């Protein structure tokens, strides 16, 4: 994550995710941010978060 007036922040991931925006359709992209210790990662030819 790029915090305000900062190129980095070591405590923060900025996190992009697919989600159903209507009740039961219209998948789209959306973004937020989270603390690390709700986040994990290993897999994919390129990385992938959960």
């Amino acid at each position: 994550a790029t915090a305000s007036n900062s190129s980095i922040i070591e405590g923060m991931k900025n996190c992009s995710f697919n989600i159903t925006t209507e009740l039961r359709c219209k998948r789209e992209k959306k973004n937020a941010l989270f603390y690390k210790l709700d986040i994990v990662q290993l897999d994919g030819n390129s990385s992938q978060y959960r």
Epitope: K36, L37, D38, I39, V40
Partner: nanobody
């Protein structure tokens, strides 16, 4: 010092079950997750699963979920495993393990590497 002590060696019938124990010392047993690991002769180690004595949550490799079961007791300082429906491929040396301590800078599950092991136990599937 830290040590994990295991049951005696086993030779058991095909199709039956094999049950193993792993008793610890040198640390509070209720405050470290515990792993289970197997190695056939000359082969890789294969993950079995993990258990957290503090809660009893369990997670298995889906390859073995129908075959393996764990449990742990805080009053015994001991973890148990049970592998059902033995086959000849199960002939292997089995281990229990302990993870390293979490530290402030670590992300989740950085510490589940194997910090300490036991001396292992031989299991053979034979009549």
């Amino acid at each position: 010092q830290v040590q994990l002590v295991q049951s005696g060696a086993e030779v058991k019938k095909p199709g039956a079950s094999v049950k193993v124990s792993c008793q610890a010392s040198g640390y509070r047993f209720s405050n470290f997750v515990i792993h289970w690991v197997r190695q056939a002769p000359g082969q890789r180690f294969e993950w079995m699963g993990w258990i957290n004595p503090y809660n009893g949550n369990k997670e298995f490799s889906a390859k073995f979920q129908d075959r393996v079961t764990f449990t742990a007791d805080t009053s015994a300082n001991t973890a148990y495993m049970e592998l059902r429906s033995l086959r000849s491929a199960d002939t292997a040396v089995y281990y229990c393990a302990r993870v390293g301590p979490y530290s402030w800078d670590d992300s989740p599950q950085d510490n589940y590497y194997m910090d300490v092991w036991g001396k292992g136990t031989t299991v053979i599937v034979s009549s």
